[PDB]
């Protein structure tokens, strides 16, 4: 009922500005403090700062006083936050979170992505991972689809457009040589393959890609 | 600041056994010490407010105990749904901090991998790359190794291993080894091969193809 919706994924130069929000839904949004929390890789989490919409009344931890801005919109019920100065040290997930009344943060953002670089937009290149010509043998086959060169995070796989959830395998992405790459896999029985259509759907936000690639068996 | 300092920053469990997640504060921070679970797609809960208290759709197998400086979470009994990273937070009063997060495995019977290896796709050599695969699915524990071959000798250049986040149904990982290089370097060998040691078994699980396709 109470939702937090924030935000996509932002690609920015480093000595930029991003601003990022959240829209509040299911609630009465001038009556609660609204906070901001920063998640970086490997490093906790940073309560970064508050705001109560109904009189635009701040607070902020000394640290991000100058370097981030909250502010709201009634008329819109949405939560704002402008980081500005932006470097390495601020590629994170933002969420927002909800505080009170009489618990804390009970409710939260699903996080947006900030990552800070100098390094342009990089859609993906897919590969079918199609098992070998001299391959022997089994009731299930495993398939996948390589993801390779892509910048920056996230990317999302599904398979059969959603439709295919069992038996799938995605790996968490790997940065390498300033690109991302990951592989996603899934076993389905030998008579659903190469019998229908095994569609890997990946899409790339940054860069607005929604890929397609075909599993088919190899050229004998 | 008041620094939150979480005991461990990873934990391993059995299925049904008791679990507990510490947290210590810099200072008394009276009873005011939160507990959050955050998923691996990102998505945070709160479990555990004022200590004690537990919130939204919490099982009772959560408790939470206090001294105003250590805390701890509780689990009586872990359960399958329980997996993810789980960080203290205390809320006193400005600035709000926050512990670096435990994250919970569990701990699973052994089981090994099954073993995969995928040449490079045409569509890949036509454009002048090659990646080979090895993947290996549904193993328990995480840790393992995989070696490379081409054409019986080791490479370790140009390999690529990650691995997927702990099944939420059955606790297994996979993981999967890509070995890049040019179509160019690729057509001059034949023997492609990787061997996956793990401790389910003193030999490794070899799989093999030759681009010669026999
Ligand atoms: C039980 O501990 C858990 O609750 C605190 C959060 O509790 C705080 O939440 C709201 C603030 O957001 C605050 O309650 C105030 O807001 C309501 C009005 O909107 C009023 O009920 C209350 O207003 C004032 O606050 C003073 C409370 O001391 C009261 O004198 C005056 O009415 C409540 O303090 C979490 O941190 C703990 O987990």
């Known amino acids: 009922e109470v939702q937090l919706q924030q935000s996509g994924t932002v690609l920015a130069r480093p000595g930029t500005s991003v601003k990022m929000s959240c829209k509040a839904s299911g609630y009465s949004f001038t009556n609660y403090w609204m906070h901001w929390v920063k998640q970086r890789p490997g490093q906790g989490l940073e309560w970064i700062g508050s705001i109560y919409p109904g009189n635009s009344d701040t607070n902020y931890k000394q640290k991000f006083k100058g370097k981030a801005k909250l502010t709201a919109v009634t008329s819109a019920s949405t939560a704002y936050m402008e980081v500005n100065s932006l470097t390495n040290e601020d590629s994170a997930v933002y969420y927002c979170?909800?505080?009170?009344?009489?618990?804390?943060?009970?409710?939260w953002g699903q996080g947006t992505l900030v990552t800070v670089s100098a390094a342009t937009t990089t859609a993906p290149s897919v590969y079918p991972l199609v098992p070998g010509c001299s391959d022997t043998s089994g009731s299930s086959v495993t398939l996948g689809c390589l993801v390779k060169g892509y910048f920056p995070e996230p990317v999302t796989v599904k398979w059969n457009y959603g439709a295919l959830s069992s038996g799938v395998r995605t790996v968490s992405s790997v940065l390498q040589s300033g690109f991302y790459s990951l592989s996603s896999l899934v076993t389905v029985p030998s008579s659903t393959w190469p019998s229908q259509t095994v569609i890997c759907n990946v899409a790339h936000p940054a860069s607005k890609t929604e890929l397609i690639k075909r599993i088919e068996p190899r050229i004998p | 600041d008041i620094q939150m300092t979480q005991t461990t920053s990873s934990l391993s469990a059995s299925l049904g056994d008791r679990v507990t997640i510490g947290c210590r504060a810099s200072?008394?921070?009276?009873?005011?010490l939160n507990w959050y679970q955050q998923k691996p797609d990102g998505a945070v809960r709160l479990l555990i407010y004022?200590?004690?208290r537990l919130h939204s759709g919490v099982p009772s197998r959560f408790s939470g105990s206090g001294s105003g400086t250590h805390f701890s979470l509780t689990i009586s009994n872990l359960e399958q749904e329980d997996i993810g990273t789980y960080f203290c937070?205390?809320?006193?009063?400005?600035?709000?901090?926050f512990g670096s997060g435990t994250k919970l495995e569990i701990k699973r019977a052994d089981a090994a991998p099954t073993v995969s290896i995928f040449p490079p796709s045409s569509e890949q050599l036509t454009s002048g790359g090659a990646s080979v695969v090895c993947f290996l699915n549904n193993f328990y524990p995480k840790d393992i190794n995989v070696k490379w071959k081409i054409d019986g000798s080791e490479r370790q250049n140009g390999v690529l291993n990650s691995w997927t986040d702990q099944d939420s149904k059955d606790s297994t990982y996979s993981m999967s080894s890509t070995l890049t290089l040019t179509k160019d370097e690729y057509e001059r060998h034949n023997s492609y091969t990787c061997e996956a040691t793990h401790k389910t078994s003193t030999s490794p699980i070899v799989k093999s193809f030759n681009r010669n396709e026999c």
């Open positions: 979170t909800r505080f009170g009344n009489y618990v804390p943060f009970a409710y």
């Open positions: 937070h205390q809320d006193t009063k400005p600035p709000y901090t």
């Open positions: 200072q008394d921070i009276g009873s005011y």
């Open positions: 004022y200590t004690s």
